[PDB]
């Protein structure tokens, strides 16, 4: 702490006796001035957002693919993965609309590395200020290469990193939080809510419904100070089928149920597409090798003409599997292109699945006579 | 809106085209100045906190009863009720500690009054600065009458009102939120989380495990600027049973099952008491009539000497049931002392209930020969 609470632990102060101190923080202004976005990255982002919103509204028959490392921990690897992916995306420019999984943390119940933002040297130093710096810079570099997608959590943290997202996602732990639903209703891109830890759809229905309305809440402004914010709202929201405590909900029947309750909520019609399926995480029962297989199911629903499906989430890294960051050595003790956060499928798995989906969208074209 | 995004709609800019613009805000330093907490309120607040920290470590053999409106919405009415409860609160004082349920906003997914802070004019005018004024004014009056407790909904707001809380809960929906755990660890009083909307008990155990720890995050400081905060961690933590979509857990079995899971967690031992019961919300199935009978169940388990219990929650009001705030009417014409959120028990029932539980505490005393 730069400022230190000299009175920590005294239980005769009304407040703050549990507070160690404070460290200076950088307002989003200064960073947004320091790390601006190039017009090319700007253009990437905007046209990306719109096209997504097109696919949502029934306007485009393409399919959205949010794929990438579950968390990002090493930048050079991010440029490698982004250029390799911009290659294959170049190849599929007319079918998939692929967007990268730029995630800077895995939220956890158990102690660990707290994400790229919190622990920048990965040794629990917590000079988060740097974390942000380098982390935002990586985006002013990536957005020139391809569109990226973050997951929301710290109402405060996006202020620094929202202008780079062309889409966002919301986690199960946080999907019931009216905080976050407000936050989406402010955000400047489409947002996908993950269905509850037990599987529940209702939480995600409720989040979309919430996020569409206009909201007022306390938030943090670009000059690092507090004000009251008004959100026009965000109607271009969707649902991400995910969890396993109740089991896997990727099965076709599950998708139909999602659709029946979505038209039971006025949240979709036959012409709009609001369903994203997330394989990594809950449906894979926590094994990377299970990721390819579900792909099999989604493709198949496309082949029969499933038009509700808007997009698909994929856990993916240059090298497959996962690894434990060493007690000692930090980032230098990690294998190159290998996920710290979740087990990913290897680049090879990833390209074979992409060819499969490129074809599935074509077959949906042929059976619908589209 | 004071400031107005003049670009709200041009989905052509990097960011902020879903933000209406913002409204100025009284910083917490200032609101901690305009309304200070008199020395008597200071005394009540801290004596209560230490009392609850005793009950939590088994040093006290009395019972924490958090009782009050589902939502506090009429400050005259609240003063009247805090009067009454404080009067009988020392009637039973030897028996248990009575903390009043000072909540400001009831979490939802639907349209309606977003609490006293967001819309305290009750007209969807949203004059939030005043909301805060009013509300802190309220608080500093109430801590002179009896200590209080509130529901931590968001993490900017308690900068304005924390020092009136002797004690706080984390709403069922936000328990899984990393954010509310990090916030929890700094607060200078006891926190008890509510179990997940399924009824699941792992969320709350994990939250207790996290909040014990020391965390560093981004938070708002008393002057009104964001900063990096380190917390000591709050070890003064517990669990609240409240119900779910499944498993209403107000029974002897369910409590013992829970105690066993907390023991398996290394959070408590047979001397400590880490379990609080909510008798509204799920357990009551939105039926105020079923609250007293749940008191009865409790009273029975205390007659049996159940020593892991630290408290009970209770949504009580001057007049029972609830009433519908007319959306096309004002708060001008509304029944006095009738909670406008979840259905409450009457004043007479409240006398009754409280007497009955006092008896229960006496009975547990005799069971272990204390």
Q: Report the phi/psi class of residue A16: left, alpha or beta, with left for phi > 0 and alpha for psi in -120 to 50.
A: left
- Between strands B19-23 and B63-68, the pairing is unpaired
Q: Which of B15, B200, B232 is opposite residue A162, by nearest beta carbon? A: B15
The C-alpha atoms of residue A21 and residue B231 are separated, in whole angstroms, by 8
Helix (H, G, I), strand (E, B) or coil at A21: strand
Residues of B in contact with A128 (CB under 8 A): 216, 218, 228
Q: How far apart are the first and last CA of chain B?
A: 61
DSSP string of B289-338? THHHHHHHHHHHHHHTT--SEEEEEEEB-SBSB-----TTS-TTS--TTB
Q: Which of B154, B185, B200 is opposite residue A179, by nearest beta carbon? A: B154
Query: Closest Cα partner for A70 from A344, A363, A357, A362?
Result: A344
DSSP string of A59-94? S---EEEEEE-SS---HHHHHHHHHHHHHHHHHTTT
Query: Closest Cα partner for B325 from B125, B111, B127, B152?
Result: B111
Contact A31, A157 (CB under 8 A): no
Note whether A342 contacts B: Cβ–Cβ < 8 A.
no
Window A:240-269, CB contacts with B under 8 Å: none
Query: Closest Cα partner for B85 from B331, B316, B298?
Result: B316
Contact A41, A163 (CB under 8 A): no
CA distances from B55 to B59, B275, B361 (A): 6, 11, 13
Q: How many CB pairs under 8 A join A and B?
A: 218
Using the 8-state DSSP alphabet, how is residue B157 labeled?
T
Interface residue of B53, B188, B215 to substitute, partner A, most A CBs within 10 Å? B188
Detail the DSSP E strand segments found in A123-175.
148-152, 165-170
A241 beta partners: A277
For A217-232, letters b (16+ CB in 10 Å) and e give: bbbbbbebbbbbbbbb
Window A:33-72, CB contacts with B under 8 Å: 37, 42, 45-46, 49-50
The C-alpha atoms of residue B290 and residue B231 are separated, in whole angstroms, by 40
The C-alpha atoms of residue A358 and residue B81 are separated, in whole angstroms, by 66
Note whether B108 contacts A: Cβ–Cβ < 8 A.
yes
- Count Cβ atoms within 10 A of the Cβ of residue B15 and give its class: 0-12 exposed, 13-18 middle, 19 or more buried: buried
Query: Closest Cα partner for A311 from A24, A38, A32, A60?
Result: A60
Query: Listing from the earlier edge strand, what are the strands of the sheet with B19-23?
Result: A215-220, A226-231, B19-23
Note whether B179 contacts A: Cβ–Cβ < 8 A.
yes
The C-alpha atoms of residue A301 and residue A214 are separated, in whole angstroms, by 35
Q: In whole angstroms, how large is the CA radius of gyration of chain B? A: 21
Query: Closest Cα partner for A130 from A26, A20, A4, A21?
Result: A26
CA distance B98 to chain A (A): 20
The C-alpha atoms of residue A315 and residue B93 are separated, in whole angstroms, by 57
- Count Cβ atoms within 10 A of the Cβ of residue A8 and give its class: 0-12 exposed, 13-18 middle, 19 or more buried: middle
Domain regions of chain B by residue span: 1-370
Using the 8-state DSSP alphabet, how is residue A302 labeled?
H
Query: Closest Cα partner for A118 from B333, B228, B201, B188?
Result: B228
**Residue B137 token pair:** 């004014």
Residues of B in contact with A187 (CB under 8 A): 18
**Maximal C-alpha separation, chain B:** 74
Q: Which of A18, A177, A233 is opposite residue B177, by nearest beta carbon? A: A177
DSSP string of A209-246? HHHHS-EEEEEE-TTSBEEEEEE-----EEEEE---SS
The C-alpha atoms of residue A319 and residue A343 are separated, in whole angstroms, by 10
Query: Closest Cα partner for B171 from B313, B311, B316?
Result: B313
Contact A19 B229 (CB under 8 A): yes
The C-alpha atoms of residue B320 and residue A337 are separated, in whole angstroms, by 62
Contact B176 A153 (CB under 8 A): no
Contact A166, A100 (CB under 8 A): no
DSSP string of B112-155? S--HHHH-SSSSS---HHHHHHHHHHHHHHHTTTS-EEEE---S
Calculate the CA B92 to chain-centre distance. 21
A220 beta partners: A226
Calculate the CA B189 to chain-centre distance. 12
A66 beta partners: A99, A313
The C-alpha atoms of residue A256 and residue B277 are separated, in whole angstroms, by 39
Contact A341, A103 (CB under 8 A): yes
**Residue B205 token pair:** 């155990």
Measured between CA atoms, the residue of chain B closest to residue A22 is B229
Contact B128, B121 (CB under 8 A): no
Query: Listing from the earlier edge strand, what are the strands of the sheet with A3-4?
Result: A3-4, A19-23, B226-231, B216-220
Query: Closest Cα partner for B169 from B190, B138, B197?
Result: B190
Contact B241, B255 (CB under 8 A): yes
The C-alpha atoms of residue B62 and residue A266 are separated, in whole angstroms, by 51
CA distance A201 to chain B (A): 12
């Amino acid at each position: 702490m730069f400022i230190k609470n000299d009175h920590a632990g005294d239980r005769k102060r009304l407040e703050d006796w549990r507070i160690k101190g404070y460290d200076p923080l950088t307002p989003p202004d200064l960073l947004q001035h320091e790390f601006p976005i190039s017009a090319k990255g700007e253009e990437n982002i905007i046209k990306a957002r719109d096209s997504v919103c097109d696919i949502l509204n029934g306007k485009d028959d393409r399919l959205v693919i949010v794929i990438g490392p579950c968390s990002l921990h090493d930048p050079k690897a991010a440029y490698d993965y982004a250029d390799r992916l911009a290659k294959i995306s170049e190849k599929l420019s007319k079918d998939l609309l692929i967007i990268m999984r730029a995630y800077l943390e895995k939220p956890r119940t158990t102690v660990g590395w707290k994400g790229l933002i919190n622990d920048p040297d990965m040794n629990n130093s917590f000079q988060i200020n740097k974390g942000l710096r380098i982390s935002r810079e990586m985006f002013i570099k990536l957005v020139e290469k391809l569109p990226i997608a973050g997951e929301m959590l710290d109402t405060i943290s996006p202020q620094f990193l929202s202008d780079c997202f062309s889409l966002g996602a919301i986690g199960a732990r946080t999907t019931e939080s009216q905080l976050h639903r407000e936050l989406a209703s402010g955000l400047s891109f489409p947002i996908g809510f993950k269905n509850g830890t037990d599987g529940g759809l209702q939480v995600a229905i409720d989040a979309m419904r919430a996020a569409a309305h206009e909201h007022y809440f306390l938030s943090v402004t670009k000059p690092g100070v507090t004000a009251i914010v008004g959100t026009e709202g965000n109607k271009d929201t969707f649902l991400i089928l995910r969890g396993g405590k109740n089991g896997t909900n990727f099965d076709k029947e599950s998708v139909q149920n999602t659709k029946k309750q979505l038209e039971k909520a006025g949240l979709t019609d036959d012409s709009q597409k609001r369903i994203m399926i997330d394989c990594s995480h809950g449906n894979s029962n926590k094994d990377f090798k299970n990721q390819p297989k579900v792909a099999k199911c989604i493709y198949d629903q496309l082949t029969e003409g499933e038009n509700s499906l808007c997009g698909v989430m994929i856990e993916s890294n240059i090298n497959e599997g996962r690894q434990d960051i060493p007690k000692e050595g930090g980032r230098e003790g990690l294998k190159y292109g290998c996920s710290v956060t979740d087990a990913c499928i290897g680049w090879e798995s990833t390209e074979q699945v992409l060819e499969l989906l490129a074809e599935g969208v074509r077959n949906r074209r042929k059976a619908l006579k589209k």
